[PDB]
Amino acid sequence: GSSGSSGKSEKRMKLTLKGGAAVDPDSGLEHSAHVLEKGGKVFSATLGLVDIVKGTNSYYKLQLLEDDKENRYWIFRSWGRVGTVIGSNKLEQMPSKEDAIEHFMKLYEEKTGNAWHSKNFTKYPKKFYPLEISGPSSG
């Protein structure tokens, strides 16, 4: 036996099929949703904090995933010590894209303490900072 076939035909009518950053597999939206990109930017920030006294090392990750089905979004939040028994994540669906951005903007604003879209970064006590820094501004 044997057979084959193929085709190609579509009408682009208000559709933005594209991505940017990679999504976490633990989110289960890596094969469904994708990193929420805005203003030619990516909603993928990697913060890290480690006490010198407590000798405890922490790491906070933030990623705003966007549903590429109809119109939905989730809010991924990872936290826990560095290489330990700890390790937990949070996944919640957002009502509106904004509600997702706001949270993602406030969340990253709570850890670091500074607004996501803010200039000048003050290394506060406990406040988390950006680990892997790349691109213009800051660093």
Nearest to 74 by CA among 82, 86, 66, 83: 66
Residue 62: domain span? 32-131
Count of CA atoms in the C-beta half-sphere (13 A) of 29: 24
With a CB cutoff of 8 Å and minimum separation 6, the contacts of 115 are: 105, 109
Residue 58 domain flag? yes
Distance separating alpha carbons of residues 66 and 72, to the nearest angstrom: 6
Total domains in the fold of the chain: 1
The experimental method is: NMR
Single-letter amino acid, residue 1: G
